[PDB]
Design an enzyme around this catalytic site. Sequence first.
Site, PDB file in Angstrom:
ATOM      1  N   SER C 275       0.816  -1.208   0.000  1.00 27.58           N
ATOM      2  CA  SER C 275       0.000   0.000   0.000  1.00 27.58           C
ATOM      3  C   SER C 275       0.852   1.261   0.000  1.00 27.58           C
ATOM      4  O   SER C 275       0.607   2.194  -0.768  1.00 27.58           O
ATOM      5  CB  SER C 275      -0.932  -0.011   1.208  1.00 27.58           C
ATOM      6  OG  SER C 275      -0.205  -0.228   2.402  1.00 27.58           O
ATOM      7  N   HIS C 303      -5.185  -5.657   0.266  1.00 25.86           N
ATOM      8  CA  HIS C 303      -5.414  -4.539  -0.636  1.00 25.86           C
ATOM      9  C   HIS C 303      -5.742  -4.962  -2.059  1.00 25.86           C
ATOM     10  O   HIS C 303      -6.037  -4.101  -2.889  1.00 25.86           O
ATOM     11  CB  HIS C 303      -4.188  -3.621  -0.650  1.00 25.86           C
ATOM     12  CG  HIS C 303      -4.063  -2.762   0.564  1.00 25.86           C
ATOM     13  ND1 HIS C 303      -4.609  -1.500   0.641  1.00 25.86           N
ATOM     14  CD2 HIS C 303      -3.467  -2.986   1.757  1.00 25.86           C
ATOM     15  CE1 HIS C 303      -4.353  -0.985   1.828  1.00 25.86           C
ATOM     16  NE2 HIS C 303      -3.661  -1.867   2.524  1.00 25.86           N
ATOM     17  N   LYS C 335     -11.100  -3.202   3.597  1.00 24.51           N
ATOM     18  CA  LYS C 335     -10.763  -2.266   2.521  1.00 24.51           C
ATOM     19  C   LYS C 335     -11.709  -2.142   1.323  1.00 24.51           C
ATOM     20  O   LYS C 335     -11.825  -1.064   0.739  1.00 24.51           O
ATOM     21  CB  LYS C 335      -9.343  -2.543   2.017  1.00 24.51           C
ATOM     22  CG  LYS C 335      -8.248  -1.995   2.919  1.00 24.51           C
ATOM     23  CD  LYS C 335      -7.555  -3.109   3.687  1.00 24.51           C
ATOM     24  CE  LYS C 335      -6.715  -2.555   4.826  1.00 24.51           C
ATOM     25  NZ  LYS C 335      -5.627  -3.493   5.220  1.00 24.51           N
TER      26      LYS C 335
END
Lengths: 48, 423, 499, 153, 41
Positions: C275, C303, C335
């Site tokens: 990230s 992610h 997320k």
Amino acid sequence: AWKQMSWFYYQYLLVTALYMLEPWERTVFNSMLVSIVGMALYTGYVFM
Amino acid sequence: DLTVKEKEELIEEWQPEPLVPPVPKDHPALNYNIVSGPPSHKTVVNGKECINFASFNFLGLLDNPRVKAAALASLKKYGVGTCGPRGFYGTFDVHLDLEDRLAKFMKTEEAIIYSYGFATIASAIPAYSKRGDIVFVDRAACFAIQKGLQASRSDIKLFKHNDMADLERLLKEQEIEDQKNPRKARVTRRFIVVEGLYMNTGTICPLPELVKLKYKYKARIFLEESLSFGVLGEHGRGVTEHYGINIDDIDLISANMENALASIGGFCCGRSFVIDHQRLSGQGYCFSASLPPLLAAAAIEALNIMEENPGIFAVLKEKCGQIHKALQGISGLKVVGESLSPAFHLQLEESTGSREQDVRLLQEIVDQCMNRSIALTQARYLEKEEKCLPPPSIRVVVTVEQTEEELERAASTIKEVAQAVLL
Amino acid sequence: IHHVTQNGGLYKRPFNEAFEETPMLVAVLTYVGYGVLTLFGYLRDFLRYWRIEKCHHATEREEQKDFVSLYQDFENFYTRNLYMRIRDNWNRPICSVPGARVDIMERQSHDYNWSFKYTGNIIKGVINMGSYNYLGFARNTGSCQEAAAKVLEEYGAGVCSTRQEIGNLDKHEELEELVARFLGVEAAMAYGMGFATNSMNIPALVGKGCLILSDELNHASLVLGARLSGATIRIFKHNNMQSLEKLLKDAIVYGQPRTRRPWKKILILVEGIYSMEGSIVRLPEVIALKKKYKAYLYLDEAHSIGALGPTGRGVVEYFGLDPEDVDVMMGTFTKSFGASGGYIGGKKELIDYLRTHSHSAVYATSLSPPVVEQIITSMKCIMGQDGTSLGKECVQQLAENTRYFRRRLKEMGFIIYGNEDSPVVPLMLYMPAKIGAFGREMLKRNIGVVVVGFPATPIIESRARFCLSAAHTKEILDTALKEIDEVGDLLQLKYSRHR
Amino acid sequence: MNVGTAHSEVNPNTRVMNSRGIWLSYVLAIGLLHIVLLSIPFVSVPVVWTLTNLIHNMGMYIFLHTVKGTPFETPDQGKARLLTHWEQMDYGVQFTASRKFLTITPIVLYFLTSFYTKYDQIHFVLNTVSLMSVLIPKLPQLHGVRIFGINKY
Amino acid sequence: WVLVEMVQALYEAPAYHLILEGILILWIIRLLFSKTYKLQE
Ligand SMILES: CCCCCCCCCCCCC/C=C/[C@@H](O)[C@H](CO)NC(=O)CCCCCCCCCCCCCCCCCCCCCCC
């Protein structure tokens, strides 16, 4: 003119990290930089 | 040395072990119970209607209308998820309200909330203890305390369960070590880790004798009380209120919001000087997403209900002094735990030989009782990963939602089926 | 199809990243700022002895003055001398549903961030580019919210037990069956926290006599699980296949350190997207290299799941690979789905072993029912089992937004890290004072961002991070780009040489 | 902020001296110190060059061989809490590029200071005693030793 | 113009001030050829 001066000083504050220092802390740095420049301008004139 | 031909052969010869080992289906587990609907007072386990003596909501509050109404109103305002780790736009105004509210309930200066009950004490211990420190820990501490003590690579000394004659012996052995190297003794920190109402035994810690040891040998106390918060005391503050001990003498208190608050998460309370350090050095607090707001709005309402009428802690205290007194006299089973505890044990007298034989005996009583509307469980451990492995046992858990008639009904039924399996 | 390497890796479309090197003058000018800050920090620490009292910091009790002090003083030199000077950039409280627009609570300080106070005012509509809200599922209207409230009315907010005693409801069994069909694997298990999913499951798979090979940029939970397992840990350079193969080759021919015995097993830990760095793992090469040396792969897609892939099935679908080549797959629900928790997927014998031997299943409380329902309802939208077409639109809109935003930033002169398809966009800030100036300037224009400094990264690699979402329209992105362009002239952040 | 956010290095203090642009920044600082000392009017050139050498060695000794620990909290639980900065460089591996650069720089500065002093007898003592105090701690044999238990805890 | 005086002092520099400088040069060369090698275990 005046606005251009404020921007160059703003850049100077950002490069030296004086931007995040307190008002009395900035005065110390400014004093011992102006005095060192003034004391060099004198020696570079009386010794040249 | 070692030419290119050899290496190829070395690489081809190697064969690893499988990722997970074989021969399952001999474990007692791997046969989870299925519960249909919520695990309330009257539930359905494995398709059977029964009264449950196995959940940990001592005060009700799981299906209270007010708590549900307060959680719904916060669901309609924020949604479900806090999409961020509390340091990047992960902090809501409800989180700040809940911490401020917990501090006023416990009468401390500050509080910090974690999003997971197991991580709160597993993160707090390594934030203060480092490689050169000495920790004195009760032998009967729970698994989360053990993991927290393993993460902090300090020196762990275990003392016998609940006797201060052994803790004082260890502390005085430390003095001799201190005396022959004074310069190293001024940079080592000492901690005593205890618990109020131990989960694994059902007994209570002697706190007045331990506060006096603290000021004599200069060691700080870490009190983990996730089973006495909301249970003990006149106002439910825990084991400090039970003994009338000033809370400034403790240095850290940790509990979870999942037993009497019937919610998710955990918290720590104390002075700002100790609490403010975890916001920048607790692993589960810095690198994890924060608690969903509807779960915090449910804990605030539970705190409101607890404060409004503290007579509930008096009904819970005398409710559990009856079933503890009713289970005295069963042939083959001994009761383990204090009378003031809502989660005592029930252990096998005169063991057989192996641990597998005992677990098979206890599951027979549990499965036989589930057939007569009494839902119970036995305690579950990771056998190989325990410092000290407790004996097999059955959990009996008391809540304010149980009537006196069904409390005595449960005690008669357990006796009936324990005298026909252990005969 | 497109191009293959020498290891065996097979790429079907071009795979191109870029990490431009910091210019020499800029690199020199940052050491000046860090040096000045260090020098003034020493002066302030000296003045705290017998001078200006600073009676605002917490102190030990009077009754415990003869104890050993609780903290090492030199640690948190940085906390009180650099971090405290710009800390009004981080713990900003919000009072609204976080997505595409958010309400911030105004706070001001009068003692240089040693304490805050609220002004009672709220900044209405701030463009949110600091929250993980891919696919835009974080909202307070729709079908997901409706289903969650319905479940909340009958179940409650809490469970009061563990999966192994009485805390295993039918909702958990319904969710774990759906995750397995979503990932295309045999079986799955759900946990309740994403940090816990790694730190309480990795030590159940390896121990003494096993080797863990970890990438240079793994998350803190992976590192903590590796530290708690008891195995040996060796680090290889980020996305360097020449480095990982050398490490993996040297592991097998020399064996364990002292006894020199063969290893019991070898486990590789990677991630789908990093990230803070913005990069995607070279999965085809890692899989081709894991097969030849007989290792095991552990993939962390916190992610990647939902964010990548032609249909939202993570980084495995992005490369066109087969999910059955990965021994352990995990991810989080925080997320892309609007909820909380984590999962593990794999073979049925892995999940049976985890269901009886993981720390979470034995000692921790299980998921909340209202959170489980929201995951079920949002996953059924992405798959397409809702009768609508709202799942295809978000997946396409995210990709469109990433390409547009990333491409327009690259041609204004900024330095951007990462892969062209990554939805996280790091913008390189180098000088320590620009970390604190950028966050203030951007909030002055109604834009919320994340900034990270020296201790968190490398010394000359500070940055800001932008998180793109499918809920961002074209006019919102135009406004944000317009303001970024202005601030980049104000602070001189257009460092790119090979523009 | 927090160690472990963007990089997984457990002790970020061990890699600072290998970063891009720091060997040039370290030489420009010596240059700036020399230019600032050269501006004092009541001083000769040999005294300027002796002051440059002594101040550089003094500051170097304090920063590399006296202060121990890290200025931040690391997730290794205080493993490097009793080591100086020189001892934590590259996790104790000897004769790396940075340990060679930092060992050769004082000798080169001493060679210039000897030449600009005209090899004076008084100055030689000060400069040699100053140079030895910053070369003894860099020997691999002195890793972890503390004379008379000085600066131990 | 002061440069030649220092070169003149070099020739008249005492022998014990150049033996040490030669020894230091012989240490720089040995240093530039040493290998890596982790401390010990
Ligand atoms: C006034 C000019 C400011 C620059 C000179 C100030 C010198 C101060 C040096 C700082 C000492 C730190 C070195 C070792 C520290 C360790 O001990 C500690 C504890 O282990 N660990 C640390 O991690 C220290 C904090 C972070 C380590 C590195 C940050 C500081 C590194 C600065 C690199 C060199 C600074 C001098 C650069 C000045 C260059 C000036 C050249 C001319 C500039 C204009 C050119 C156009």
